[PDB]
Design a protein around this ligand. Structure first.
Ligand SMILES: *[C@@H]1O[C@H](CO)[C@@H](O[C@@H]2O[C@H](CO)[C@@H](O[C@@H]3O[C@H](CO)[C@@H](O)[C@H](O)[C@@H]3O)[C@H](O)[C@H]2NC(C)=O)[C@H](O)[C@H]1NC(C)=O
Ligand SMILES: *[C@@H]1O[C@H](CO)[C@@H](O[C@@H]2O[C@H](CO)[C@@H](O)[C@H](O)[C@H]2NC(C)=O)[C@H](O)[C@H]1NC(C)=O
Ligand SMILES: *[C@@H]1O[C@H](CO)[C@@H](O[C@@H]2O[C@H](CO)[C@@H](O)[C@H](O)[C@H]2NC(C)=O)[C@H](O)[C@H]1NC(C)=O
Ligand SMILES: *[C@@H]1O[C@H](CO)[C@@H](O[C@@H]2O[C@H](CO)[C@@H](O)[C@H](O)[C@H]2NC(C)=O)[C@H](O)[C@H]1NC(C)=O
Ligand SMILES: *[C@@H]1O[C@H](CO)[C@@H](O)[C@H](O)[C@H]1NC(C)=O
Ligand SMILES: *[C@@H]1O[C@H](CO)[C@@H](O)[C@H](O)[C@H]1NC(C)=O
Ligand SMILES: *[C@@H]1O[C@H](CO)[C@@H](O)[C@H](O)[C@H]1NC(C)=O
Ligand SMILES: *[C@@H]1O[C@H](CO)[C@@H](O)[C@H](O)[C@H]1NC(C)=O
Lengths: 49, 147, 49, 97, 49, 31, 49
């Protein structure tokens, strides 16, 4: 799915969802709030543990 | 000069640390303080004695405590020019309050005397508190009650 | 836990190379010119005139 | 799920508002499960965490205040709209994952 | 290890030279300052037909 | 408790020069 | 012979400028791109290169 024209404020994800895995490659997590992203896509699926 | 109070809001809505030095020993207390808007010590000028005074009203939810060894301090008023210069450096980093201290005998009547002095590290307090503001604690010499 | 379902979302993007429509939460300021400033442009930070 | 956030350079509700490690941290981190001790059938709510805060906490900095939180930033009362309590309780049950 | 004339303050345990090499240390059991020196100090050449 | 002082002069924030003061030992290494 | 001397001096300085676009095992030669994207620990590895 394509994402465009939005503010990526993941603080709203707090208190709603809890991630067992969260790993970023090519970027820093603490740097996520100060950046602007281009051609961002979200891939969704389900696997086993 | 007896010490300082360091805190973000300077009331009981946040933690503050007091490094006051009472007449007997140095007390470092990081606690949730209901700080008085005008905190002071009181030593009677004629008597040269320290009587109890209030820096804070109440204390609770409080974390850090340290009491120094007993020592004697001279409360008497003194004549002449300024005799002592006490230099401190306070740094707040990584949850630690670094205190560096130095002492020098001076005879200046006014202003800050020029010179060079290397301060040695005396304290590294593990407080972990947000410090954005501070207030000095000075003793008072009331000649007459109510004044 | 090895055989329990896990939902996976993979976000892909590019940084500081193309126009960006998705941005982190930041307050923009007025454009100052002919002065030495610390600038941030779509996540690209630096110092200059 | 919050144990992974106890590490230098991490982001999350714990790393931002509860506990942060320095980038140059020297030491060791130890964690162990305590479902038998800290969890109950009726649920254990004695443990809390800060979920709302205006700014991220600094390394090895602590915030034990309990002040109502407004996204605008002005003081407010809990019954008022857009005014919340910053601390949320962990719900620890025996049957939890 | 040789006895040292260096005077350590109570908050100092190690000393370094201009090369950042640890050349002085306060012994833990007996608070005496010792001098650390390299074991190699030889200028050696070999003459052969 | 919480006694107040009345009729106080404003400090006026006098300024002076630091000179060469304020230097402290940066670490615990003997040099 | 005099022209050859001035040509070499200008060529050396222009080679110095063009070598700033050089990566040395790093993700990018742009210092601002690295600093806008990585933490001080992760940027330290790239900046040192
Ligand atoms: C300056 O501050 C220090 C630290 O607060 C004061 O020392 C403390 O004084 C209190 C009251 O005298 C002591 O509490 C007493 O402890 C004894 C047992 O040791 C107990 O029998 C009494 O009923 C009372 O609880 C406290 O221990 C003492 N702390 C230490 C270790 O110094 C000091 O008196 C202050 N001096 C002034 C008022 O200038
Ligand atoms: C925290 O500080 C506030 C403000 O000083 C305290 O509120 C005062 O409480 C005293 C004693 O009940 C009253 O006489 C004052 O009139 C109150 N002032 C205000 C502005 O409300 C509060 O009680 C303190 N809380 C604790 C636990 O120390
Ligand atoms: C220390 O306390 C001050 C005051 O509470 C904090 O300053 C606030 O910072 C947030 C986020 O930037 C702002 O939204 C508030 O408006 C600020 N308040 C004031 C009055 O300055 C500061 O962030 C705290 N520092 C830390 C890291 O704990
Ligand atoms: C720590 O323990 C060592 C070993 O017991 C002490 O060294 C000896 O101390 C005694 C009494 O001063 C001397 O008679 C011996 O000759 C010492 N032996 C050595 C190894 O030199 C040392 O003094 C103790 N230090 C402290 C901190 O008490
Ligand atoms: C989570 O936060 C929302 C506000 O964004 C609040 O309405 C809700 O009660 C909170 N708790 C939940 C969803 O358990
Ligand atoms: C998803 O929506 C449901 C129903 O409103 C809600 O109970 C749940 O907490 C939501 N979870 C997230 C990830 O927000
Ligand atoms: C002077 O100090 C002593 C000891 O604190 C006290 O007993 C006495 O009452 C004081 N006198 C005055 C002038 O208050
Ligand atoms: C101390 O903190 C706890 C938890 O936030 C709070 O319940 C308590 O009321 C605080 N102290 C007092 C006596 O106000």
């Amino acid at each position: 799915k394509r994402i465009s024209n939005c503010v990526a404020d993941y603080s709203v994800l707090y208190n709603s969802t809890s991630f067992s895995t969260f790993k970023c490659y090519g970027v820093s997590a603490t740097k996520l709030n100060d950046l602007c992203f281009s051609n961002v896509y979200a891939d969704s699926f389900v696997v086993k543990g | 000069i007896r010490g300082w109070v360091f805190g973000s809001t300077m009331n009981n809505k946040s933690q503050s640390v007091i490094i006051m030095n009472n007449s007997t020993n140095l007390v470092i207390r990081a606690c949730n303080f209901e700080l008085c808007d005008n905190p002071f010590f009181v030593v009677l000028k004629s008597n040269n004695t320290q009587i109890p005074s209030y820096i804070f009203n109440n204390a609770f939810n409080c974390t850090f405590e340290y009491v120094s060894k007993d020592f004697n301090l001279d409360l008497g008023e003194k004549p002449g020019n300024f005799k002592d210069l006490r230099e401190f450096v306070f740094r707040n980093k990584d949850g630690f309050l670094h205190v560096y201290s130095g002492y020098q005998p001076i005879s200046a009547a006014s202003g800050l005397p020029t010179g060079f002095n290397a301060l040695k590290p005396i304290f590294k307090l593990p407080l972990g508190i947000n410090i954005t503001n501070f207030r000095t604690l000075l003793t008072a010499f009331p000649p007459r009650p109510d004044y | 836990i090895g055989y329990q379902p896990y939902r996976v979302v993979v976000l892909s993007f590019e940084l500081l190379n193309a126009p960006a429509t998705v941005c982190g939460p930041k307050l923009s300021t007025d454009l100052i010119k002919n002065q030495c400033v610390n600038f941030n442009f779509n996540g690209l930070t630096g110092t200059g005139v | 799920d919050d144990v992974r956030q106890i590490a230098p350079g991490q982001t999350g509700v714990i790393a931002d508002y509860n506990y942060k490690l320095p980038d140059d941290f020297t030491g060791c981190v130890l964690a162990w499960n305590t479902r038998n001790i800290d969890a109950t059938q009726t649920g254990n709510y004695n443990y809390k965490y800060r979920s709302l805060r205006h700014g991220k906490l600094r390394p090895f900095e602590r915030d034990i205040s309990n002040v109502p939180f407004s996204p605008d930033g002005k003081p407010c009362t809990p019954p008022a709209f857009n005014c919340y309590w910053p601390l949320n309780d962990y719900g620890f049950y025996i049957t939890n994952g | 290890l040789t006895p040292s004339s260096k005077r350590f303050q109570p908050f100092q345990q190690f000393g370094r030279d201009v090369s950042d090499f640890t050349d002085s240390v306060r012994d833990p059991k007996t608070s005496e300052i010792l001098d650390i020196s390299p074991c190699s100090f030889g200028g050696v050449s070999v003459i052969t037909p | 408790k919480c006694l107040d002082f009345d009729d106080r002069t404003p400090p006026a924030n006098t300024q002076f020069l630091s000179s060469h003061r304020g230097v402290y030992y940066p670490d615990d290494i003997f040099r | 012979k005099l022209q050859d001397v001035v040509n070499q001096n200008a060529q050396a300085l222009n080679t110095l400028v063009k070598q700033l676009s050089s990566n040395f095992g790093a993700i990018s030669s742009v210092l601002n791109d690295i600093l806008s994207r990585l933490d001080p620990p992760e940027a330290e590895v790239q900046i040192d290169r």
